[PDB]
Amino acid sequence: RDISTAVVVTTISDGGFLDRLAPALRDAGARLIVIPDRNTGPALFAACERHRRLGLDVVCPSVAEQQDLLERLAVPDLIPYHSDNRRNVGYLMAWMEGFDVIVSMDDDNLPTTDDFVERHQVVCQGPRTQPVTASSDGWFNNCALLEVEPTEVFPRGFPFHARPAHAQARTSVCERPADVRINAGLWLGDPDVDAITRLAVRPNALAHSGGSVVLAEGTWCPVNSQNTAVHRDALPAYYFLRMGQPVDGVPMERFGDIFSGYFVQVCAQHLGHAVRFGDPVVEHPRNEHDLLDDLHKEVPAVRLLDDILDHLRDHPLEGGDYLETYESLSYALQEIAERVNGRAWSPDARAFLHRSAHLMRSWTGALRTVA
Amino acid sequence: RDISTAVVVTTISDGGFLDRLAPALRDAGARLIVIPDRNTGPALFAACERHRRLGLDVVCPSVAEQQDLLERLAVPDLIPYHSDNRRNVGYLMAWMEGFDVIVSMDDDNLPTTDDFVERHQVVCQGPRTQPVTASSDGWFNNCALLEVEPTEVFPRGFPFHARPAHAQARTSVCERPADVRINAGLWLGDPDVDAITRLAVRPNALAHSGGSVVLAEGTWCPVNSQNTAVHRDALPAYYFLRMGQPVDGVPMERFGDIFSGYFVQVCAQHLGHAVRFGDPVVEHPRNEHDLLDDLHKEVPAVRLLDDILDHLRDHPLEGGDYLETYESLSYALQEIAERVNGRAWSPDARAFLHRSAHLMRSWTGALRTVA
Amino acid sequence: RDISTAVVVTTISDGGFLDRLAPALRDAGARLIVIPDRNTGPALFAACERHRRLGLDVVCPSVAEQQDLLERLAVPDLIPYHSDNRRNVGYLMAWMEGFDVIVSMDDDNLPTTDDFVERHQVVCQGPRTQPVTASSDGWFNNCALLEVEPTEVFPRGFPFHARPAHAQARTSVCERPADVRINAGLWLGDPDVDAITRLAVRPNALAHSGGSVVLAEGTWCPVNSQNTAVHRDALPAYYFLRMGQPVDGVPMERFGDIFSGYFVQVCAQHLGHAVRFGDPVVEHPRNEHDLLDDLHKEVPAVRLLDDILDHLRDHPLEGGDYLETYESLSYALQEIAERVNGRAWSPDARAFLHRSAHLMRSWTGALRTVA
Amino acid sequence: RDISTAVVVTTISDGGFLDRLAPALRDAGARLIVIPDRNTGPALFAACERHRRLGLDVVCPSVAEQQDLLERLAVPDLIPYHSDNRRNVGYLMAWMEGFDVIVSMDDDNLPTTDDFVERHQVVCQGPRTQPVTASSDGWFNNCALLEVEPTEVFPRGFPFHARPAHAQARTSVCERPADVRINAGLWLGDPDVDAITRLAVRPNALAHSGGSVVLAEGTWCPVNSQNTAVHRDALPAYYFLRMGQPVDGVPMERFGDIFSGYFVQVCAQHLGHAVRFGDPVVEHPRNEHDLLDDLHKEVPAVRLLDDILDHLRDHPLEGGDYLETYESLSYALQEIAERVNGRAWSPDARAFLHRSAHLMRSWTGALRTVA
Ligand SMILES: Nc1nc2c(ncn2[C@@H]2O[C@H](COP(=O)(O)OP(=O)(O)O)[C@@H](O)[C@H]2O)c(=O)[nH]1
Ligand SMILES: Nc1nc2c(ncn2[C@@H]2O[C@H](COP(=O)(O)OP(=O)(O)O)[C@@H](O)[C@H]2O)c(=O)[nH]1
Ligand SMILES: Nc1nc2c(ncn2[C@@H]2O[C@H](COP(=O)(O)OP(=O)(O)O)[C@@H](O)[C@H]2O)c(=O)[nH]1
Ligand SMILES: Nc1nc2c(ncn2[C@@H]2O[C@H](COP(=O)(O)OP(=O)(O)O)[C@@H](O)[C@H]2O)c(=O)[nH]1
């Protein structure tokens, strides 16, 4: 096979998560690209070298090295600091170094099986006729593949308009050609639900009981960047979107991977590729964060996501590869920003899509400079 | 007994809800005070007279009559228009006319039993040793008295900080003297949950299985104005709080009765009175409203309610009656507005408590002019 | 000569300004394009019909005829209603009809001479060696051509950073080739100063004493749309910028023509064309408006204008005509939106330039459709 | 006479202003109370110690000694840090220590004469029949007492609605009893104009030519805290108002002394006391700051000041001293906050007056504690 894998993780911690994460990555020979920030102490760099002495191919480029690379690519102001958006640096580096599979992870996620890297390499198997899962409402709930207490939940980024009628939706499985390029692994413990769901029922993912699915064309499901493998061809469309844009005066946050998960998904289906949900599963322990502050950060994006996803189905895309398709998607979002109507579509909400459109083309422009 | 009852309802509808609501009120001889607004058509007034010809003691004062009364009480700018805050006009009128019990209802609530008015008259029974319900965490979940699908929920206004540990709280029932002055009836169908809960699980109240409870001193539970009887002595502390105050730039709404339900509750316990939860139960059908807009309106209040309720337990109150105690509460909230700290306590959030403090004293001042 | 002139005016008034504006336009055979809005009464349409019978070639398309034209050009949402941005409709119509000169006016401006149209036809003279005016600081104060009391003033849109040192700048006149394509006529009575200047000194323009000037390459001066002729080739770059974008939460207004005046000016100098200031002079009487409300709307623009103009001098442009150069300018504004730094450059301020750039391309896309 | 004078200055500088300020204060035996902040370096404390050995009675309480004093007075959250509002600490300290005259100054002001302290002692002369200056429009322009180029200006805080017609107002001088308690010394160089005036004309005060005046009852003029003596009886009404309250989402600043100057002025005239303008004159050199940032902070104040001053003329006050009259003023401001109407009076603008009224009473409550 000779499939190369690079794991991208951004962090501002001391690096203690490497003690449990390294054995799963060192046995498979995959590279771990750790992207620190300006608010990251020197304990992380000392923890990376010690794990490298144990055999782990871990790279931790300092802030000066990251900024020097971004300035050499004419994008010095694209990726901000004091933000998890810096994982785009790891996406770029892993793509420059020619890795076949790029696995995006959070520093608080831990693999639960010994074949974590092997299962994520499913995005490099190629096209073949395989069981594909379709839904009559065009949406699939990946949380239905898990055993969740005390009630059924939806993943973060799932549109709220389609939730009440999703119970009556018909799910079909058919043998059809498909080419998996994005594999979204599931999570045990604290699932990836929005702040609205975590505040209401505080869900707990007990086990992974539904297996794995490959979504057919027209059936969507949000993809995060906490346990997701992306084939190197689809990485140009996996740019982690810049947050902070105000919606009716409230700065938007915590949805950078919601847009990127949908953007790489609509580009993949335009090119005849599919998204996979299921294994490998990680353990996401419950972190102690102000859930009311998470809600305050997620509401601005939630008010717009339903309309954005609705117009993306009506808008056809152009392109022969992910670079051309992602740039065609950026201009599509600018037409949507002026066509959409609603109470939450203030001038700053519309301009959010326009600024995001420029940053996405600035991302693709940087990838075209190295290539 | 000779107990007089007045039902206060504000509406902007055509008055079609009177066809089913009048029989429950006409048989008991209670008065129905309907408060229209400027955005209310002339069909409501024609529907009130026809139901009055059938025997219902229904009063529907026009906007000109309401404003003339408020200007005669030196409060012309207290109650705004195009808002459900106009139910304060019904509170004032029912209190001026000397009614013993004032039942606050929404126009979309319908009694389910033939003893609706009789059960709400429990607030005029007087003090007596009776089973009182206490909780080790100081909070009672009235939704636990209902059969709810698909999972357990909390009422709108219940603090989020105490929800995770509320399952391990110990509930006790003891024989203690108590004087019920506020009776919060429950609701079937769509329960009174916040927008966070309704978006996540979309609860459905099937039946009322837990009976009725009287909360002891120190055990709180939010009280709404959709199906709640208030003894005429406690009405001065039941002022429906003015909404629209921005919190970090976002106008607050949909929590006018959350503050009033807590304010009349903390005043009642200071004076040795209690709040009752249970019967009579009404049917609240599910209305078709933008749940994401409700969330946008409720988040500003939700970010502050936990801290406000926390400081109210530390702040002692003064007063011999509800007028003195409510005014003492207003000054207490101004001290809290400067002592509280947090990320959501911007200058406009603190000033919200100060403006609310003036409006509450303006409400008590109006009641002292008629009295 | 056989020069066709079209005057573009948008208004919501009754049309009384036609009585004093028609004689100067009817004696010259020019067309007046009146663009009404939704808040325009039916008395304006009757005013245009009477002056039509008096010999004035005046057209007044209803809002239904405006939206029909804008929809056929795939720009139904470009131009908003209840806004003076609707003068773009007159710009478009006059450009489709093939008029050589387009004179942009406000409805409260009145010509003071008989040769009003003849003087504005200077934009159709062609290139010739003529005295051009240059300034050592790169800025020219057109209000210095007027007699203003009680003190010297700068026009609306003049950068504030260059004002204190402008008195020390040297003004030189040289014989150089120039092609006048924009002619900004001056104004007596209430000059076109910003709300800051009008609140401080309330200037009064008494006379036009400085004659007329043609600015050399590198010397700029703001151009408004109240008394300005534009050659039809330069009209594609004269799109009246859409207002309402928030800057730190404050929506901007009253500066749509400030950007359009600078945008058509930087495009003209790139193509070797020049801007003229001086005659014909109009009379702008002191209007009736709250100056503090004008200030509240102009401050968000003023906070960004100096930085935008500074970066436009460094950013080179491309293009062979005004359509290509304007589109090149739009992409230049998006790069400036990410390189600029300052306390006023919040995320919404940067996104303002990105949304404006899309609307500029939407304007050029509509012109390329009729072409 | 045996008149004790205390000069109050808050600063974050190194203390170099002490070299040119001490001689005028040391030769008069006055005390200088320097109030540092958290962002004040250790070089200031060494500067006060050297001038202490040179004979200057200068005190410089550390932020630990400030918070200890403010906590014992039950006002630990009244005065914020990183703000020039900390000059209230100097007002409090000088009042506790029993000084007769309190001179409020900024650290960038320098006396121009030897009798600086002696002239400020005019607030301790007592009542006497003296020439008082009245104006037919109820406003006096103290900048008319100075020689200002290039044109006439109004002081910061002067209402904008009264400026255009002020030139037509009649100024009369009459022999009437008056008791000067506030003396606002004038300023040369950069006068105390608002950011609107400084941006438009950049005034320069060349000389003090108009002498000094004492304003009659009904004639007002804004008083700042940069060069102003306050009799100790009037200090309770001279509380420097806390800034930062949003007006339509924009936080206000730079107007803390504008309100305090008007508040102590309306309280003084209610008690039969007068305000004086003129000598002693200081030199305020042109500072180094972004004028557009000053404008951004002053506009929210300017939008409300005219309406606040208009209602203060109609609202009568009560009280026998400055403590009672200031508290009566605070409740008067809350009634104005609900009666006032206008486009700038959003809910947060009204709540600004309510929170300010509580802080005013918190200030008076602390003074009644030490008393
Ligand atoms: N570069 C960078 N990464 C961050 C920062 N904050 C968080 N992250 C990363 O973003 C991911 C999400 O973190 P967070 O939202 O705090 O997770 P939580 O603790 O479960 O709430 C984590 O895996 C972090 O490694 C930051 O300031 N800079
Ligand atoms: N006076 C007045 N009352 C209102 C207005 N809007 C709603 N209400 C009342 O407030 C209550 C709450 O209404 P609403 O929030 O719309 O209930 P929903 O339909 O279930 O969402 C209703 O019983 C209405 O009678 C209004 O504009 N003016
Ligand atoms: N279509 C349209 N035009 C407007 C509107 N308001 C103003 N205008 C036009 O825009 C120009 C500017 O007017 P205005 O803003 O009132 O200038 P002012 O004198 O400074 O107040 C006028 O000539 C009006 O004809 C509007 O709501 N719609
Ligand atoms: N305690 C404190 N005082 C300040 C601070 N900033 C300014 N001051 C004082 O407030 C006065 C006003 O200064 P400033 O706002 O810079 O005036 P400017 O010349 O118009 O810029 C000065 O005399 C300073 O000593 C601060 O952060 N803390």
Residue numbers in the entry:
A (entry chain B), B (entry chain B), C (entry chain A), D (entry chain A): 4 to 374
Q: What does the original paper state about this entry?
A:
MtdL from deep sea–derived Marinactinospora thermotolerans SCSIO 00652 has been discovered in the antibiotic A201A biosynthetic pathway, generating GDP-L-galactofuranose (L-Galf) from GDP-L-galactopyranose (L-Galp). The MtdL subunit is divided into three regions: the N-terminal region (residues 1–111), the core region (residues 112–291), and the C-terminal region (residues 292–376). The characteristic DXD motif (Asp109-Asp110-Asp111), together with conserved His287, coordinates a Mn2+ ion, which stabilizes the diphosphate of the nucleotide.
The initial structure of MtdL at 2.1-Å resolution was determined using single-wavelength anomalous diffraction phasing from cocrystals of selenomethionine (SeMet) derivative MtdL with GDP. Then, the complex structure of MtdL bound to Mn2+ and GDP at 2.1-Å resolution was obtained by cocrystallizing MtdL containing 0.5 mM MnCl2 with GDP, which led to a clear electron density for both the GDP diphosphate moiety and the Mn2+ ion at the active site. Both SeMet-MtdL·GDP and MtdL·Mn2+·GDP structures contain two protein chains per asymmetric unit (ASU) that can be superimposed with root-mean-square deviations (RMSDs) of 0.079 A˚ and 0.081 A˚ over 308 and 353 Cα atoms, respectively. A tetramer as a dimer of dimers was suggested by PISA for crystal structures of both GDP·SeMet-MtdL belonging to space group C2 and GDP·Mn2+·MtdL belonging to space group C2221. Structural comparison of GDP-MtdL complexes in the absence and presence of Mn2+ indicated a major conformational change in loop A (residues 288–292), which follows the Mn2+ coordinating His287 on β15.
